[PDB]
């Protein structure tokens with residue numbers, strides 16, 4: 001048995017996140033520095049209004065993906081790490097999951113840094129003392145301890161941050177536009193003086209930013225409110241009410257702040273609003289500076305933990321269930337995370353990570369197909385928590401599922417500017433024949449699937 005109280009399905013009575021609450025989780029989660037960089041550098045190839053469109057479109061495809069990747073986590077309360085055991089082996093799943101726990105772990109050390117940068121700036125703007133590594137650890141530590149309260153903290157931190165973050169941001173837009181003496185409509189077309197990038201590849205950059213989060217949204221949405229006694233059609237609207245809720249959460253947030261990064265590039269040549277606003281206004285008081293850094297800190301705290309630390313935690317305590325618990329996996333994830341010192345390799349590896357990211361397309365494709373198409377939403381929680389059962393396949397690993405991944409990754413390369421969507425579509429389509437083959441050797445269903453509700 002692989003079950004322990006932390007990696008256990010989340011019982012109907014334990015659920016705490018409704019449709020309104022999830023948007024407030026996503027809105028603040030979308031407000032973060034790394035879109036500034038992304039949306040800023042985009043002004044090199046397109047003008048601001050198209051980037052906003054590349055953002056809304058890229059935001060929506062992520063949501064179209066969420067409607068599907070979230071449906072199993074909401075209904076059955078299960079892990080990401082646990083759920084992968086289905087198509088890949090119980091152990092074979094550890095391969096893509098290790099790729100993914102790694103991305104996630106990377107992103108955690110990047111934002112701890114940006115956060116650290118903020119706190120260190122707040123302090124050195126009060127004392128000239130300027131030690132970052134100490135502020136790194138201390139920040140890593142602070143998140144973990146607030147992460148100990150799992151989704152309970154996250155949901156509360158984000159409902160109060162959201163309007164504040166929304167307000168600090170709308171304010172920011174006023175300050176830029178005013179101090180430069182420019183209307184909104186004027187800034188909306190100032191970019192794109194170096195065309196070359198396909199607009200599809202533009203859209204693919206905003207999707208693929210949240211590719212880690214969306215492919216493993218599970219770790220968030222297993223906490224969502226569900227009515228166990230719905231139907232096919234009430235379950236679909238439930239899924240849809242949530243997918244819509246995630247849309248209303250990540251779109252208006254990342255559009256306002258995407259625009260700020262782009263505006264920054266376009267007004268002063270820097271994606272970083274700290275620089276661009278400082279200039280345009282010609283310096284600012286130490287208070288109003290510290291604020292901005294508080295923004296960065298508030299903007300980092302509402303995104304890093306929930307998106308980057310939750311999922312390796314659950315990966316640890318659920319693969320080594322007697323070795324790790326949720327709280328200890330969190331400590332081990334933030335430590336592994338920081339000891340990768342990713343803030344000195346983000347510059348370099350940029351193009352490399354975009355590859356690893358869009359190579360999760362088959363993972364999402366194989367997972368959507370396994371649960372929805374092959375098995376028809378009919379799963380056995382019982383077997384997911386046991387070393388030997390219908391999800392063990394060949395001695396813990398489903399090599400045929402690992403084959404579809406490779407194959408789909410290859411085919412993915414035939415369309416570099418649409419890589420992600422072809423490999424998913426390829427894996428999705430290939431899992432079907434691959435699984436109708438494996439079903440001749442191993443069973444796709446189990447008797448024990450009637451104990452499902454016991455877990456809930």
Ligand SMILES: O=C1NC(=O)[C@H](Cc2ccc3ccccc3c2)N1
Nearest residue numbers: 034038107205206209210212213307
């Ligand atoms: O899963 C994740 N955890 C994270 O910290 C990042 C956040 C992120 C980074 C870059 C982006 C670039 C373009 C659009 C969205 C982006 C989002 N992703």
Ligand code: NA
Nearest residue numbers: 028299302303
């Ligand atoms: Na945030």
